[PDB]
Scaffold this active site. Sequence first.
Site, PDB file in Angstrom:
ATOM      1  N   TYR A  81      24.025  34.539  68.146  1.00 29.85           N
ATOM      2  CA  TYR A  81      24.183  35.518  68.206  1.00 29.85           C
ATOM      3  C   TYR A  81      23.183  35.556  69.799  1.00 29.85           C
ATOM      4  O   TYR A  81      22.487  36.296  70.370  1.00 29.85           O
ATOM      5  CB  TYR A  81      23.862  37.115  68.095  1.00 29.85           C
ATOM      6  CG  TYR A  81      25.256  37.548  67.148  1.00 29.85           C
ATOM      7  CD1 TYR A  81      26.510  36.440  67.211  1.00 29.85           C
ATOM      8  CD2 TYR A  81      25.581  38.982  67.018  1.00 29.85           C
ATOM      9  CE1 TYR A  81      27.459  37.190  66.343  1.00 29.85           C
ATOM     10  CE2 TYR A  81      26.252  39.264  66.076  1.00 29.85           C
ATOM     11  CZ  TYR A  81      27.443  38.380  66.480  1.00 29.85           C
ATOM     12  OH  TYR A  81      28.586  39.021  65.707  1.00 29.85           O
ATOM     13  N   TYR A  95      34.669  45.519  70.257  1.00 26.10           N
ATOM     14  CA  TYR A  95      34.207  44.124  69.215  1.00 26.10           C
ATOM     15  C   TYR A  95      34.832  42.919  69.319  1.00 26.10           C
ATOM     16  O   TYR A  95      35.969  42.740  68.746  1.00 26.10           O
ATOM     17  CB  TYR A  95      33.294  44.774  68.196  1.00 26.10           C
ATOM     18  CG  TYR A  95      32.403  43.455  67.610  1.00 26.10           C
ATOM     19  CD1 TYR A  95      31.069  43.143  68.605  1.00 26.10           C
ATOM     20  CD2 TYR A  95      32.488  43.115  66.591  1.00 26.10           C
ATOM     21  CE1 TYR A  95      29.729  42.121  67.766  1.00 26.10           C
ATOM     22  CE2 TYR A  95      31.157  42.028  66.333  1.00 26.10           C
ATOM     23  CZ  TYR A  95      30.077  41.738  67.165  1.00 26.10           C
ATOM     24  OH  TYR A  95      29.075  41.539  66.274  1.00 26.10           O
ATOM     25  N   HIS A  96      34.612  41.477  69.425  1.00 23.90           N
ATOM     26  CA  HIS A  96      34.824  40.440  69.547  1.00 23.90           C
ATOM     27  C   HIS A  96      35.991  40.115  70.512  1.00 23.90           C
ATOM     28  O   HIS A  96      37.084  39.298  70.228  1.00 23.90           O
ATOM     29  CB  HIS A  96      35.632  40.225  68.740  1.00 23.90           C
ATOM     30  CG  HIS A  96      34.180  40.277  67.310  1.00 23.90           C
ATOM     31  ND1 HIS A  96      34.714  39.597  66.034  1.00 23.90           N
ATOM     32  CD2 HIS A  96      32.826  39.124  67.447  1.00 23.90           C
ATOM     33  CE1 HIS A  96      33.212  39.653  65.339  1.00 23.90           C
ATOM     34  NE2 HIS A  96      32.358  39.196  66.407  1.00 23.90           N
ATOM     35  N   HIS A  98      30.958  37.587  73.384  1.00 23.56           N
ATOM     36  CA  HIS A  98      29.889  38.953  72.096  1.00 23.56           C
ATOM     37  C   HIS A  98      29.930  39.258  73.568  1.00 23.56           C
ATOM     38  O   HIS A  98      28.164  39.584  73.798  1.00 23.56           O
ATOM     39  CB  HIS A  98      29.200  38.262  71.656  1.00 23.56           C
ATOM     40  CG  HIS A  98      29.330  38.090  70.335  1.00 23.56           C
ATOM     41  ND1 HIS A  98      30.100  36.686  69.793  1.00 23.56           N
ATOM     42  CD2 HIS A  98      29.374  38.826  68.882  1.00 23.56           C
ATOM     43  CE1 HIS A  98      30.553  37.396  68.851  1.00 23.56           C
ATOM     44  NE2 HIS A  98      29.844  37.555  67.910  1.00 23.56           N
TER      45      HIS A  98
HETATM   46 CU   LIG Z   1      30.271  38.807  66.504  1.00 21.88          CU
END
Ligand SMILES: [Cu+]
Length: 639
Positions: A272, A495-496, A581
């Site tokens: 990340y 998310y994603h 992300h």
């Molecule tokens: Cu993730």
Amino acid sequence: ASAPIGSAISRNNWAVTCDSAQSGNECNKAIDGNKDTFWHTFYGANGDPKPPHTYTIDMKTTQNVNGLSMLPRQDGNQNGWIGRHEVYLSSDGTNWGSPVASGSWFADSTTKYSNFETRPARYVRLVAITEANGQPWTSIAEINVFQASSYTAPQPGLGRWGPTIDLPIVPAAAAIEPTSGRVLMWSSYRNDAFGGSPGGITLTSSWDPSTGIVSDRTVTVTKHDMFCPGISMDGNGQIVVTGGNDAKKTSLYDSSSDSWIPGPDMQVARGYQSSATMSDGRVFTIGGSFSGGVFEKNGEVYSPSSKTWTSLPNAKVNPMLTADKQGLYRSDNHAWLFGWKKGSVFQAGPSTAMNWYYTSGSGDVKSAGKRQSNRGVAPDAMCGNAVMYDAVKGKILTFGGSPDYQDSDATTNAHIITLGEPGTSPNTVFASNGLYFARTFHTSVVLPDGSTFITGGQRRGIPFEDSTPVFTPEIYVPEQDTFYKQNPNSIVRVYHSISLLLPDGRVFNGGGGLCGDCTTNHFDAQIFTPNYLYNSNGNLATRPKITRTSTQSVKVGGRITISTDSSISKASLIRYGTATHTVNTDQRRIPLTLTNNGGNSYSFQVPSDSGVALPGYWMLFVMNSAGVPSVASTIRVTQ
Ligand SMILES: [Cu+]
Ligand code: NA
């Protein structure tokens, strides 16, 4: 698992047709409500007519269709699983028009879906172009069509959503393959999951905008599970994927040969993190506590030439840390990085404190002041977006996000940061009156005209949950310092989720989910066609054509001469992007000052400062007086 965006239509009155249906596997076996019975095309004694195979439905009456579901045979056999496919909607049963959805469904017995913008229709046609393993059949256990609550025609001049590209995976990470114009997408070791990975494998998927084909390939040669990685396109045009599930690995993607090549391990294991390409072609990265450990991970730099990763311990990650309630695990994640002058990298956020990172020697970090405006100091904006829409004037637009990674309210905050020389505290002001909708986990892309397209997200960050979704995308127009709402879409992108600018000037937005048995996995993407590709009548405008280019490879400071089929008023270079992300450190725009050679012949110079005109692949776009952009010509910039 996944889910449809609408509710099932009653299949009572329906009339079904098939190209072939072997006795015992009638066309109607597909709508009988029994998951043990299935339609199946001719085979054996009636011959094995190869695909395509067609399943048409006359719902008798008009319904506001917004999706369909297909359930494979549940008897333990693979025969008849649909691979490539298309979904058509008709009002008359003759004119089918363009497909509302197409792509490739993964090879397994789970329910597949096709979710698309609501369009009133009476008939539905599912064409099975191929079979998941190359056999001649098509067997559908149960097929369903869905309807929205109501239908609201898109407003004129506010762009259009559609069609839907059905994918075999959840595109949580993606990039444009510059030499081919294909969209590369990847999930993890599994198509819908990352949890419980043995490492060393990544399911990738490609979509060719020209041909409309979705093809997936399994990568294991780099022994890398590329989920939650850092992404940067280096000075040599190769895409540098770093860490993630396999926290120390580096995988390189070569667009030219369309292959993955093993890269050197990083010095520090990360996940990340954000990586950003420097003015000299190298790659800089910092942070990333999602994987490889939770501790202070400082900057390091990759060299394409020597194929090495060099640690830069004094390029301290500490000053860029947010005040996330989950601590360091999240606080060093997704930095808003931008390659700038003299090897410097500007960190715009998400932390309130902005900084200058230097890559000479063992690195260094210098405070650039706080992201603020007359409305006060801006809070930590984790998962907010940052887009350099005018690199020539060092313009960066920031927006959205929240204080914490999750269980935190999103903000409508938006700022314009104006970079100068590395080391000097850049200027910051509020962008208009902020976003229309507070959102986090949203994505954005800079468009050819310098406007920034913002889409998806939710008001409150809750990974894997499709709550408080924003279906209305916005577009910021720098010349007016005004945001404009665009036509809403129907698929939740939280998310994603990802977004990329396509070579044709349209936006590719998809993904979201990747949580295994969750119902929130979105195995698709949609295309957004900005209003600039339409004329007053609501039709597709005639686009200027770039008939000639003096060269397609230019050194910074060099000049390019082009020839168009009509007079152009504006031109711009847009660096190819990568996304995951909410991070995209590769895209950036350069406004071109044109010299009119006359006779529809023009010249321009690529900025001599490689910190503005970062090396790699770029997209050339020309616009006519009407504002309609040509498709992009690929120009490789070198220092
Ligand atoms: Cu993730
Ligand atoms: Na059935």
